[PDB]
Homo-oligomer: A and B are copies of this chain.
């Protein structure tokens, strides 16, 4: 995998669709110097600073970062990245981790308000029905019960102690062996009710600009209105969960997954409970916003 200014990029061991982007130690060192004056708390109060820290990182990569992130995330054949910075790999560096993740996100779009934290990101600690270790968290898309589309999901590993399992699960729609069967079903186009934990109605599948399937699915929030929709959804669920195309991805401390939420589903594998278990995560979810040469009216 290739050499860019300030970082390297290589395919993952799980899939060529998922690429691993690592910022050099020198880029990392300089980034942290140049953003030291804004603590995370400044980023939380002034959203424009989220874009500024973005600019600082991209400028350190000779402006090669932003176009690469976008080309990868929007490329149907790929659409997923695992990102890290050499030197940021310990829980003591959580703030620095948030700054990094924030900078990358705000080069490609904007992170949405998170109702769990009341901020643009959320950090969660896991320590020893839905909260359950031996439970796989089923593959899904985020953002299914609001009108606005969530284009990206960012999941960062902040701490990991005494943890067995709990890999991120991923499925690219084009690796799913049953796509054609479910996409070509009439109920693939049936608007269904999705309800928060005001209701919205949208189909479970849609298409991208070129007519290729995309999904907006989660088992917990979809609300089949009758026996027809119900049985079909229970079959679709089994067809996703038993897929041979599912990826299992370890996310080491300091690294984060950044994926296109339209044609990747994500989930979490089970893990072993242990009295001294500690896992800390950070999430952001947002929309893409980027410049292209395209048409406009007026002056």
Question: When A48-B237, A110-B226, A222-B48 are in contact, do A231 and B291 touch as well, CB less than 8 Å?
Answer: no
Distance of A51 Cα from B45 Cα, bound (Å): 38
Give the residue of B39, B50, B130, B228 whose beta carbon is less than 8 angstroms from that of A230: B50
For A220, list chain B residues within 8 Å (CB): 45-46
Ordered by A's residue number, 10 sampled pairs between the chains whose C-beta atoms are within 8 Å are: A45-B130, A45-B219, A46-B219, A46-B220, A47-B223, A48-B222, A48-B224, A51-B231, A106-B227, A109-B226
Task: Using A46-B220, A48-B219 as known contacts, say yes or no to A54 and B227 having CB atoms under 8 A apart.
Answer: yes
Specify which chain B residues have a CB less than 8 angstroms from the CB of A45 in the assembled complex.
Answer: 129-130, 219-220
Docked pose: A55 CA to B229 CA in angstroms: 12
Of all A-B residue pairs in the complex, the 10 with the closest CB atoms, nearest first, are: A51-B230, A226-B289, A48-B233, A41-B129, A52-B234, A48-B234, A46-B219, A48-B230, A48-B224, A51-B227
CA distance A225 to B224 in the complex (A): 34
Residues of B within 8 A of A290 (CB): 226-227
A106-B230, A231-B52 known; A222-B129 Cβ under 8 A? no
Chain A residues numbered 52-74 whose CB sits less than 8 Å from any CB in chain B: 52, 54-55, 66
Please name 11 further chain A to chain B contacts, defined as beta carbons within 8 Å, in addition to the given A51-B234, A110-B226, sorted by A numbering.
A41-B129, A45-B129, A45-B220, A46-B220, A48-B230, A51-B224, A51-B230, A51-B231, A52-B231, A66-B227, A228-B291
Determine chain A's interface SS by DSSP, over half rule.
helix
In contact, B227 and A107 (Cβ under 8 angstroms): yes
Q: Which residues of B contact A291 (CB under 8 A)?
A: 228
Residues of B within 8 A of A41 (CB): 129
Measured CA separation A107–B54 after assembly (Å): 49
CB-CB contacts of A28-43 with B at 8 A, as 1s and 0s?
A: 0000000000010110
Interface residues of A in 155-183 (CB under 8 A from B): none
Nearest CB in chain B to that of A51: its residue: B230
A218, closest chain B residue (CB): B46
Report which of B47, B48, B109, B230 forms a contact with A52, defined as CB distance below 8 A. Answer: B230
